[PDB]
Design a protein around this nucleic acid. Structure first.
Ligand SMILES: [Ca+2]
Ligand SMILES: [Ca+2]
Lengths: 289, 288
DNA sequence: TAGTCGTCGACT
DNA sequence: TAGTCGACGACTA
């Protein structure tokens, strides 16, 4: 179907009002999983980007967790829901030798303590750069997941992660989305450069400093929204990075309204039958309006 | 200009006149204490200048790195007067690259500069193992890794197996082997596993043909015992040096005795500022 | 006989 | 909202 394309201000307002921005964060907060399980759930989720599967895997411990993760990485043995071991679209490439070498890296480093990976990435928080560099130590973990982890370390784990001036470090898609926005969104004021000249409204010549000008205007725009999952602070670059990215998909025909909440529940219902944590995941998931 | 020799005749010259690698003989003769030898080597592996390395080898602990950072910065004068010299092979060990290299060594060895060469040497091992240890250090890449690995065996006497190392030789010796298969009629045709003959064309030489070339030259020089002490027949380590120096000879950049002549001229000044530098100059082999 | 870096394209 | 590999050219007095 070919739906109405919304402005970023209205599409973002929907993402915030319906908690369709990042529903996994709400569900996770609702589950109140114990620490070691939460860390296993997270490492699984950052590998496969599938909430129900991470729930199933979060119930295995120690070397039995990595053994079950290597089975999902090899995707030869069937899955407890039947079929192959599913991947989230953002992790579609976590397969073959890339997935298995990834698991050998983690097994070599964490041995019988898989809970330590998220604990090490989380630390006691820190700056976005410090957190993302810790994430990016692990094989098959790059710039997208580093940013995602840093978001979750703050939104889910409650550690203090400073994202100040991260806009220039956003992953290619939210960054390209900021470039398009400077060109096409008239509500974004002109970016007056230090020489007094205006930055050209051309997505192909948008510099890091204009992306920062873009993100800073959007943050101010949404400042009347408290950030989900708990509404503890106003929106910052972490939510704006997500609004930027999903808006580009929305405009491209690849993000109809509620896409994430609908997609999460559909792929998670099978797992709700093989794992009590998966059943708690599906029931903690928010719903469409 | 000068007469360009075949590899067989040019290599025989390098072996007979100890012009192949004269620093190894000089080092063996100096018989320096263990910790100083490791400091001499680390300095040489950064600056590739024997006299300069000899001078710096006499400072110990953190005073060694302070003086090495001075050579890396090249802003204070040098005890020889002028700038802190570099060997041509280390012409790029300068600026932020040199200081980054030295900072890396300080961060890792602190007050024990002797530990760098000892870690590289370990108890020996495979060429591959040693060059990977060497190449952990900043501004240490494949050329110096192969060089250090050669020196751990030729100078430090630890057992380094170089078997089948031909396919790993650095850019220039490897290109020398490619040129050699094209131009040297003494190298027999390389018959591949499928029975086909590899073409006599330097731009289409594969690793297995480079190995085949290296293996033929090893056999050719097998009547030569390897310097510095003639403990074993020539292997891929000397042939790799003959290959590269022959490519240079052919390019006009290595007339006979080039290395022995250049080292002594760049080392004489240092003989006056360091007792070790004078012993180095006196242990250095001579022309003819 | 130099080593390091970033871009790009191909691959999974 | 993916990450890794190798090939290549530019750069470093
Ligand atoms: Ca995001
Ligand atoms: Ca050599």
């Amino acid at each position: 179907r070919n739906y109405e394309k919304l402005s970023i201000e209205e599409f973002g307002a929907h993402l915030l009002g319906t908690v369709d921005l990042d529903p996994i964060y709400l569900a996770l907060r609702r589950m109140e999983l114990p620490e070691a399980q939460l860390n296993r759930w997270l490492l699984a989720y950052w590998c496969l980007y599938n909430g129900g599967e991470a729930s199933y895997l979060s119930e295995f411990e120690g070397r039995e967790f990595f053994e079950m993760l290597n089975h999902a990485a090899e995707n030869v043995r069937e899955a407890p829901i039947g079929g192959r071991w599913p991947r989230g679209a953002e992790r579609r490439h976590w397969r073959g030798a890339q997935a298995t070498s990834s698991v050998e890296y983690l097994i070599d480093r964490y041995d019988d303590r898989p809970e330590d990976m998220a604990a090490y990435c989380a630390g006691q928080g820190g700056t976005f750069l410090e957190v993302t560099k810790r994430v990016q130590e692990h094989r098959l973990f790059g710039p997208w997941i580093g940013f995602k982890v840093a978001d979750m370390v703050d939104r889910v784990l409650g550690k203090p992660v400073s994202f100040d001036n991260a806009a220039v470090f956003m992953f290619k898609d939210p960054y390209k989305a900021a470039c398009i926005q400077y060109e096409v969104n008239p509500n974004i004021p002109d970016h007056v450069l230090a020489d007094g000249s205006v930055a050209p409204r051309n997505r192909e010549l948008v510099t890091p400093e204009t992306v920062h000008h873009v993100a800073q205007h959007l943050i101010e725009h949404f400042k009347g929204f408290q950030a989900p999952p708990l509404g503890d602070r106003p929106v910052n670059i972490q939510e704006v990075e997500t609004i930027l990215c999903k808006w580009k998909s929305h405009q491209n025909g690849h993000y109809p309204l509620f896409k994430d909440i609908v997609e999460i529940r559909e792929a998670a219902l099978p797992w709700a039958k093989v794992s009590k944590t998966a059943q708690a995941f599906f029931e903690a998931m928010p719903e469409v309006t």
